[PDB]
Every structure is written in C-alpha cells, then in structure tokens.
Amino acid sequence: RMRLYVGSLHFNITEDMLRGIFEPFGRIESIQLMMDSETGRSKGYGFITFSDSECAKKALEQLNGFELAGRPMKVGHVT
Amino acid sequence: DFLKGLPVYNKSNFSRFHAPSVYLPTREYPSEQIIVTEKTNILLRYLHQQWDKKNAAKKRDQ
Amino acid sequence: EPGYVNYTKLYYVLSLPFVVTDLRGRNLRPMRERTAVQGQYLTVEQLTLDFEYVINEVIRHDATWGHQFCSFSDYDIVILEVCPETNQVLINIGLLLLAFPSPTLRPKTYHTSLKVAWDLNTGIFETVSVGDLTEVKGQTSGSVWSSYRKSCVDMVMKWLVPESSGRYVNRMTNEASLKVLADSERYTWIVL
Amino acid sequence: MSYNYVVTAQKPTAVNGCVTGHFTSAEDLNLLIAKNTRLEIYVVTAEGLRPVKEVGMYGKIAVMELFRPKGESKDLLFILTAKYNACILEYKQSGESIDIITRAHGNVQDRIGRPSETGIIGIIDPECRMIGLRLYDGLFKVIPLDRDNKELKAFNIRLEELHVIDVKFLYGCQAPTICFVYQDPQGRHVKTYEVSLREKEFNKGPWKQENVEAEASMVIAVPEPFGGAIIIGQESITYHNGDKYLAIAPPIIKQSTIVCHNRVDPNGSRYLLGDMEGRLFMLLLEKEEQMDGTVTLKDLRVELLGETSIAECLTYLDNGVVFVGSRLGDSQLVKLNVDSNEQGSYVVAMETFTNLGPIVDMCVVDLERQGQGQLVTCSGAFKEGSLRIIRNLHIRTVPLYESPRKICYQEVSQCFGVLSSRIEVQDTSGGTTALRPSASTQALSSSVSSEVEVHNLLIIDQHTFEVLHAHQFLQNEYALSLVSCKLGKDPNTYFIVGTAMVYPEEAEPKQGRIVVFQYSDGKLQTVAEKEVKGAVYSMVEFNGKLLASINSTVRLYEWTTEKELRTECNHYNNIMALYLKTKGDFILVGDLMRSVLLLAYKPMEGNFEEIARDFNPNWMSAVEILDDDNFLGAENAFNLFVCQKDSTTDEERQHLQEVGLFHLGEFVNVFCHGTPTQGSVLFGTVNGMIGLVTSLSESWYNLLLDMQNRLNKVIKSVGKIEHSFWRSFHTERKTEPATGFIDGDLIESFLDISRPKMQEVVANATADDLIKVVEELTRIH
Amino acid sequence: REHVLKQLERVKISGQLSPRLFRKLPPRVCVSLKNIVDEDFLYAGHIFLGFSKCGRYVLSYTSSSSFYIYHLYWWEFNVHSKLKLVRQVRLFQDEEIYSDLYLTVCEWPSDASKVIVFGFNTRSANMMSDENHRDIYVSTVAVPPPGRCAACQDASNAQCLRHGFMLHTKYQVVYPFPTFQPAFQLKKDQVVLLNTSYSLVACAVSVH
C-alpha cells in the first residue's frame, strides 16, 4: 500500500542488502534496485514497496540521511 | 650541457673494444630454507590480534 | 565431541529434512550400508551450529559484562567471511538482551555484537569479538536490527578484496524485470 | 589420440629485464639479462661484457632483483616467476665448477585475489628487512628477510587502494616504508605506509598523501642523502619528501610516455629515462649542502641525449656505456659523450643485438633453392619494424622504419606482399605528415586508393628486398588481412587485402573492403573491390574460392568471369572470427573468446555445416590444422592445446575434445606448415622465440614420456621449480598437468649430460640407443 | 574511447590479451530473445534467468499453476541459432506452495557439476497470510553432462547419479528474518550455509 524511493547508494550495494536493512521495519511486497545494462552494476537508486503505510513511514524516519558505507542514504516518497 | 663526469667503477672496463654457455644443474641439492604463505584469513587475523590485545588489557588490572 | 555441534551423514544410490531424488521423482535409497569400491554413490553432510548455545557460552566465559547479564530476546546472524582454504565461517551475532548497568539499580534492555569463527573441519567455534553493551533508548525492534545489519555491510565493504574471474558465485534472478542477459567473459548479450 | 613434440628452434630474443650488481663475486660488476625464461649472466670486463653462464628457468621471469642482506660477501638474487615461484639464489664458483644455489624457495600464489592491471611488482627494502610484492588488487604481500629461521613466513596486508600504478620502498627510513601511486574516481594520488613486521600491518606513512598528474605512472625511490621519491607522468616530473615538493613540466617530455628509468650515480644525482619513441633523457637532481651536513634537492632538470632502440629497460654499466634492453627492436650498447655529433646527438651506438620479436606474421619460402626452406618474418614495431630472413641460424635484417603487419609470397611475381602501418601527425597546414621516412614513403613507385595510422600494401623484391611499390589505403582505412592466390578459372595471381574503417568517434568497425590487386610492370592495379559491413580479420584461399571472416561472420566468395566477388554462403555462430585455417573442405575457426570450431563446406548444398565446437572459454591467439582430425590452438595464458573430433550420437560428434595440453610460456601470433616424427609446424611469438610442433606415434610418445620422468630426477632445477609444474596447462580458471605433449628442449638436454648420468637415466635400453634417438630428433630443426 | 582494432593491435605486439582490457568496449554480439526462442514454448511463459558461468547454457524457470509448480530449464546457446532444451527438472518435489516465490539460481566458484535454487515467499501461510513466519525452499540440481559420459550411456531421458540427481529442503524462519547472502553461503565449493534463524547448517552434497 506504500512505496518509497531509495537513493545515494554505493555502487556495490545489492538488492539482498537493501531487503535486509528495510525488512525489520515491516513486510515488503517488492524491491527493485535499478541496474545498468551497459557495464552490469547498480545505478545507486531503487524502489521498496512496504505492505503497510506506517511501517514505510518509520523506515524513512530511521534511514533518511544516515550513511550506508560513507554515502548518506536518501529515502523519500513517490507521486 | 650537464652530462660530463659519468661514474667510473673501473677505467679498464670500456678501454679495449669488442665487435653464453648453458647451465645444466647436475644432481646436487643443498638447501635449508623455504617460503610459505599465511594460511589464516586477513580479516580473522586482525580480529584475533585485537581480541588477544583486549585479553592483555584484562590481565594487567586482574 | 562438543555439545553445540551436530553431524549427520547419509549415502544414496539409484537438522533439516531432505527430499533427495533423481531427475524424475524417485526418492532414491536412504542408507549407510556397505557398497565396496567407488561405484558412483551420493554423500550428504549436515554440520549444525546452535546459536542459542554459542550465545550463552560466549556471555558466560568471554564477556566482561557477563555478570550483569540476565536473559536474551531476539538474535540476528550475518556471515562476515567464509575462508574455503581453512574451512572457517566468520559469523556476526546481533543480540537484544536484559542486563543490570554499572555499579553506579534497575535492569535495562541493551544491544551488542558477537563475532565468532566457526571451523568446519572440527565443528568447534571460537570467539573473536565481544561488543560493548549499548542502551536501546526510544528505538524500536526494527530500528535496532536495521542499524546492526548496516554495520555488518559497512565492515564487509571495508574489508572487500576483489576475487579472480573464475571464483565468483553466480547469482541469477528475474522479476515478472531484466533488460539484458550478459555473458561478461565472452561479451555476448541477450536483449529481453 | 594425439601425441605431439614441441621444441625450440630460436630462443626468446626480447629483453624484459636487466640489472647490475656484484653477484658472481664482490669484485665483479655483473650484468644480468632476463629474456622471458632465460637468465644471462655477464661480467663487465676490460673487453666489454664477458658471458659467464646462461640458465633457463622453469618459469617466465617476472621479478629479477639483486640484494645484499647482512653477512653476505656478495649480492643474492631474488626471482619471482609468472606462476608465482619465488626463490633466492646464490652464485658459487669453486675453481672451474659453477653452481647456482637455491637459498630459499616457495610458491607465493594466493587462491583469492585478482591479478593487477599494471601486473606483478616485486620490490626489496634497501636495508633488506623484507621483500614486498604487489600480485593482486587490494593486497600487499610481505616476505620477511630473516636468516635465523627455517621458514620465511609470508603474509598479506590489506591495501585500501585497489588500483596501484607503481610502488617502491623508500631510502633512509627507520621503519620500512612503501611509496605508491594509485588511481580512484578523484584521480591519481601518491601515498606512503610504514610496514610493521611485528604487527603484520601498515602504519601511517612519513609524509601526507599528495595529488599527482592524471597519467603519473612510475615511482623512483631516491637514495640518501636526498631520500624521497620522484614521480614520472606524461607532462610532469615531481619530487616528494615530507615538506619538500618540486615540480617541473618540461615540454620536451609531452610527446611520448616515459616507460623506463635507471640510476646513473649511486647518490641519485642522475637518472636515465627512456620513452615510447626511443628517446633517451638525463634527469638531473641539483643538490645543495646544508650547514648541518645534510644534502637537500634544490631543482630538477631534463636533457634530451639522443635516440636509442625503443627501450623496455636501461642499465648504466661503466665509463659512459649504457645497455638498452629492447622488446620491440634490437637491444644495444650505447656510448654517452659530452660533445654532440653531426645531427647534435649525444648518443653513439657501440653494438646491436638481434631481436626477432614481436613476430606478428611469417611465411616459409624457397627463395634461392628448390627444396630448402627459409623463414621470412614481420618483426618489431614502429621505427623498429623489419623483415627477418632466417635459415639454417643465419639472420638477415631488412629495416622498414614502420610497423609490418602481414606477409605473403607471390612466386609468379618473384616478390612479397607486406601490409604496413606508419604514424602521421596533424600539422598546421593541410592534412597529416610523416615524422620519419619509412618503407611506404621510400618506394620506387607509389599509388593511392580511389596521431593517425596510415596503412599500405608494400611490394618487396624477393632478391634485394627493395620496396618496389607502395599502395596507400583510404584515409582511416586499416589493412587487416592479406592473401596471394589464383581464384576460379582466372589464370592471374592476385594480392587480396581485407580492411576496416577505423574512426575517432566509434569503437567497432561497421565498414571495410576486400580489394583484389594485380602486380604488373612495377605497379599495383586495383582489379576489383567488394564492400563489407565490418572488419575483414582473416582470409584464406579455399578450393579456388575466397574464404573471409567479417566481424562475427565467416563467408565464402566466388570469383566470376566478370572479375567480381559473389557471396556464396555464411556462418554466423561466432563472437569474433579472428583466425582461419583450412584443409580440404574443412575449416578451423579461431574465436577471440570462444576457443575453436570446425566447419565443413558442403559442395552438394552450397553451404557450411558446423561439425563440432570446443566448449571451453579459450581466448585464442593462433590456430593450425595438424591433420584431418587434430587441431592446434594457442591462447592468451601462454598455453597450447590440441582438439580432436570425439571418436554414436550427433551431439557426441558435435563436441571437440581437448586431448593435448601444454604450458608453452610464450604468446603465439602465427603458425605455419614448413621415421621418428610426422609433420612440421613452425610458430612465431611476441618474444621472438621460434618453435616447432611435430606429431609422434604412441610408442615414440611413451618412450619419450618415460625419458622425461627419468631426466627430471637427474636434471636439477634452479629455484627448485618442478618441470611438471612449469609445463602444467595453467589459466586463472584451472591448472592441469601437461598431456599428449613432449618437451623437446628437455629431451635434447640428454645429449649434454655426462656419460655416468646417461646410464642412470637409461637404467632398466643402452646409452647409445637413446643417444641415437635424441640425435635424430635434433635434426628436425 | 579505445577502438577495438587499436586494442587488438596492442595484443599482437605486447602479448597481453585479457578480458580486464576489453572491460570498457561494447558487447561483440547482441541477439534478441525472441529471435532465438522456440515458438512451441510461447504458451509456457518462461522467465529467463541468464547465462551459466561457461557461456554454453542459458537458464529459465516456469511458475505454472493455491498450488504453484516450479520448473528449472537448461537451454543450449549458440549465438544466432535457436535454443535447444537440454534439461527440464521439477523444482521442490512434493511441496505445495500457496504463494509466488522470489527464486534465485546460483552456481559454486569452481564446481560446475551442480546448481542451487533459493526460493522464498514474501510471508508464509496457515489460504490466510501468516506473519512472523517465512518459508525458505532450496534445491540442489546436477547440470547435464558436458560430453560423452560412460555411466550416462547405460540406459533402459536416463542419466547417471553423478550427472543426474536432485536435492530438496525446506525450513521456517522467524523475526528478524535472516538475510540472503548467496556469495558467502556458497563460498566453500561444495557447501551451502543456511540460516534457519535458530541454527546455521553446513550442507555438503558430493557424488563419488
């Protein structure tokens, strides 16, 4: 019911890593980390879709602006 | 302009102007030293090193 | 020999449950019986490591704050390294516990990290790091596990050494999505 | 089953390393030269270079450094091979007896870690406290130099900088210190680290990290009193030492990349620098004495001395004499002097040493006789480019002063067709101009088709090797393939060229031509042209038809009575069809990444049939057909392999089996054809080594294989490397023992061992039986 | 950018040919999925996963139907030629899955003989979706033989144990739900490390 935008990620951060970091907040329907077709590597951005709205809200509050490797993660909303 | 005064190890070496045998080692093997690589992982080695130093920091008080 | 390790071995010819079969559907033959000479036989091995045991053993013998400890709640395990040459599995242990503070009373909820090396040949575990007892103030169960996994990721990236082109673990998954299927070593693409 | 015999006809001639020191004795000044697998030891004498001993190591020499630890009366030698065999060697002479003692040895390969871009780097601390090795990205390997311990326990230190360009140990440091240039997304930087043997870790370096030029490529560790480091870039040369920083941007170095250096003076006052154009410079470190007795570096200066052969390495010897170690041309001994000559040069060549490498192409001909074969190679590169005429070895050199690419002989015209390339530069007026005269600009007559590469087809006289005619291809047109043949029912013999249009905007060619030429009355006439949609990599005459490979397609063309090429059939199952060889109706295709495949032209169908493919990820360099069922391949990891058609189901027959495997230790560019053994295939390599491959019967192979095992028990190896380990097929993916291949060099070495050792080799056959066997085998080359 | 012909000319004179040089240039061959797929498998609806470690095969799965049945496929790749089906196996034998799994097919570093299929649902069921519990499904499947196999030849699609076996396992995980770590879990050439929330199991499968 709620979709979030995840950005400013290190090029070696995997979908499985993002699932692990975001899953403790609530149930996730779909996670899609955008990859480059030319030179197969992560684009540094993606979309995580929580089953619950309040679960997605707390994930943003506790992860937005906080460093993942040395890059501060940017978690936002859509539409 | 600045080339002059080149190193001289021996003057004789290039005074007389100019214009190799193959080494087949015969049965003789005298040696008493070998080269080996660190079997343990570098991340594990570091953590072991840090925790063993922490154990020494515990023995000094106790 | 130790109580924390459990080992099971089963042989097949034409703890976790196993539905070992052929390409069709025949459940093969579960046995340990004698079949002399290498005449094509299957071998399954199961070496377990009880987290509950490891946690209680490291707090009792290797934690300075071990005397303060009461009981633990949830625990999250993240592998930090696997050394195939020495058969050593380095696992990190996230722990939510109950403990009394310094003699400066009231029991409090804390979070800590336990790094443990696990030998696959012997099955014997060894403790390599016992973290500091950090207080859980105003932060939820989800918040503490997210912060923990982030630190595990932070460490593996910091210690990341590139591997040779031929020792890579291939990982394939498609959503219903991928645009191209690439063969990196032969520069061949399948456009979807 | 396929049994093959590989033997050296000509040892590698290219020099990859050269060092000076006191190895044979404390008094002797030595010159050590590494020629891939070969180590040459000389004494710098009154006459000028006295050869003392040449040893062949069972490995490709990657690191070669002389060092003197405490207690040693003379220098010891450290060698690391491409297969990571490490050894410390001592030269021992007792009267007339000479022995190379292995002081310590072991393999330092890591299962993990990926080989670095700038390759293996091996460095030794000036105080001989340790050996440092950069083998893989993210790791720094340290071998502690302790003499009072049974084993030299080497360890890895994690390096945060994953892309290091160059590294050296610094002089005048209380703690061993490395200085290195590395690249990251922010550019290139210079950093230092202290190396702690006690903690098995790095400590903060003596001086702060500094930013360097985008193309900073080499580090020079300056000796005391100066200390510090020199970093060589494309447009600048800088000096770094704690607070001290000097920077010069001489325009004289901008044109070409400096690729080698050598210290002239022990105190580091002068250095020699060699660039990609063969220019020789002197780098001068101007000093200033302080009142506290210490010497500081006041300024840096560069002076152009002259031109030498394109240097891979340089070594100052004695009395202004410099050894120029070349990989792309002939090596030299040059004299440096204060007074400039007629051209204004300060360099005079004293001696020239023949280098056949790289052999990019070759052909076997009967020029003077009828039954006597001579080898004609396309040798060297750039200004060093030449043709080499080799016969039973006698070598004749034909300088071209430009890069030869392909060669074909045309008997009816008594000439050779040679594809060549010359560099031209964009000037102020008109188009581009040649920087030096060469074969393509000095021909008797010339024609034109109806920094940058300018391609030509050269017609060279078979007797005088005079450039009779030069035909220049179109602007941006690169000539890739060449054949001399008759086609269809046409009685004329033609020079046929396959090309590609190369532009400074795109990566892959999407246009090219097949051009048919006829040489008559001292000129080349264009008979026909055929437009293609890619690069024509390879062409072979095929049963009166023209077989060609264009990008990923193999195509058969017919030559009409109207003098036109007409496409008959195509094969598309390729990534990059680079190499083609044929025998009857069978075609062997060599892929850049997919090993080899076998095709058959079907005359009754007018199409190709894909017979079988080798399902292995071999990055091919050359291919050859040994016979109807055996196919020879050479790949990027310096290995040879033999494929055979699997001898019930169509799928079984469609799978080629690798039946022969052998680590050659050379990079093969060309294979050409030209009772104990059967057949004769000659091969040319990047190091100028010439080898021969021949077939053996089952019984001959069995006897020679047993002979190898017996010889390996008697012949001792320098650095204690096992012969079987050396010849084992090796890639980053797998390591397998050699199979179906006999090392001819090893078996020939039987004739060189003493009579008491021969009897121990032939024990449970007589010595005379095998002497007769080996002697008849030496006659195959 | 460096031209492929300029890069190839470096090889001839240097003897240095490696993929870590062709790293920046575009792919040599690009072929669309629709031009190499057999038209008889259109109604099946295959979900192509990609290439195996060696460029010989191209893998795909089927999510056929409350009750989902999974199938793993091996297709013979030959550039522009049509894909030829080599192997078709039924994933997770005698296991009824009530929800669509997010499956992943993995390969060991040096072991080409076998593959692993890790399939998990978003959340477990007990018709009704049950929270704080998740089902993990893992299958170890043997790849088809590379060439002529003496044991495979003996038949009465009959394939020997070494080049034709399958393994299936299933475990329930609790909160916090364990992290999927394919690179570490299979770092040992013949072992699968599985976090069952309560214990870590070392699973080694080998044919002798």
Ligand SMILES: NS(=O)(=O)c1ccc(S(=O)(=O)Nc2cccc3c(Cl)c[nH]c23)cc1
């Ligand atoms: N080369 S790398 O980018 O460093 C790299 C990439 C993936 C893997 S993994 O497959 O083992 N996954 C993995 C590792 C560690 C933490 C987590 C969490 Cl949390 C979820 N999945 C994790 C290892 C190393």
Ligand SMILES: [Zn+2]
């Ligand atoms: Zn089989």
